[PDB]
C-alpha cells in the first residue's frame, strides 16, 4: 500500500534525524567511555548489578535497523547509558563524572530534537 510506503518514508526520516542526534551526543563523550558495551570478560559481575546494559554502538545497530519508532524510545536508551553508569560507579570516579557531563550536555541536543520531531511531524 501507498500508506505503508509514506509511513516508511517518515520512519526513514526519523532515522535520519536520530542519526544526527546520536552523533552529537557521542561527540559529548570524547573519552569514549560509552562507545561499546561494558565487557563481561573484564567486569564478570556486571549483569548482577545492571539488568539492561546500554552503549552507543548497541544504539547505533538498532538505529540502522530502523528499530526506533519514536524519539521517546531513543531517549530511553540514552538514559540507560547514563543511569547504568551512575549506579555501578561511585560519585568520585571518572566514569560517574563522565555520565553527569554527558547528561548535562546531551540535554540541550535532546531539547531541540523534541522540537524538530514535533515540528516536522
UniProtKB/Swiss-Prot annotation:
Q: Origin, by domain of life?
A: Eukaryota
Where does it live in the cell?
Nucleus; Chromosome
UniProt tissue specificity: Highly expressed in testis.
All copies of domain Bromo, residue ranges: 9-113
Where do we see the Glycyl lysine isopeptide (Lys-Gly) (interchain with G-Cter in SUMO2) cross-link in this protein?
41
User: What is the protein's quaternary organization?
Assistant: Component of some HBO1 complex composed of KAT7/HBO1, MEAF6, ING4 and BRD1/BRPF2. Component of the MOZ/MORF complex composed at least of ING5, KAT6A, KAT6B, MEAF6 and one of BRPF1, BRD1/BRPF2 and BRPF3. Interacts (via PHD-type zinc finger domain) with unmodified histone H3. Interacts (via PWWP domain) with dimethylated and trimethylated 'Lys-79' on histone H3.
Function, please?
Scaffold subunit of various histone acetyltransferase (HAT) complexes, such as the MOZ/MORF and HBO1 complexes, that acts as a regulator of hematopoiesis. Plays a key role in HBO1 complex by directing KAT7/HBO1 specificity towards histone H3 'Lys-14' acetylation (H3K14ac), thereby promoting erythroid differentiation.
Which protein, by its recorded name, is this?
A: Bromodomain-containing protein 1
> What species was this sequence derived from?
Homo sapiens
Question: Which lineage is the organism of this entry classified under, starting from the top rank?
Answer: Eukaryota, Metazoa, Chordata, Craniata, Vertebrata
Encoding gene, per UniProt annotation: BRD1
Range within the parent protein: 555 to 674 of 1058
Amino acid at each position: 500500500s501507498m500508506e505503508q510506503v509514506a509511513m516508511e518514508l517518515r520512519l526513514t526520516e526519523l532515522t535520519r534525524l536520530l542519526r544526527s542526534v546520536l552523533d552529537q551526543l557521542q561527540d559529548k563523550d570524547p573519552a569514549r567511555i560509552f562507545a561499546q558495551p561494558v565487557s563481561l570478560k573484564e567486569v564478570p559481575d556486571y549483569l548482577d548489578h545492571i539488568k539492561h546494559p546500554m552503549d552507543f554502538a548497541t544504539m547505533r545497530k538498532r538505529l540502522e535497523a530502523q528499530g526506533y519508532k519514536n524519539l521517546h524510545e531513543f531517549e530511553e536508551d540514552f538514559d540507560l547509558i547514563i543511569d547504568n553508569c551512575m549506579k555501578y560507579n561511585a560519585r568520585d570516579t571518572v566514569f560517574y563524572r563522565a555520565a553527569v557531563r554527558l547528561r548535562d550536555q546531551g540535554g540541550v541536543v535532546l531539547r531541540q530534537a523534541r522540537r524538530e520531531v514535533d515540528s516536522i511531524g
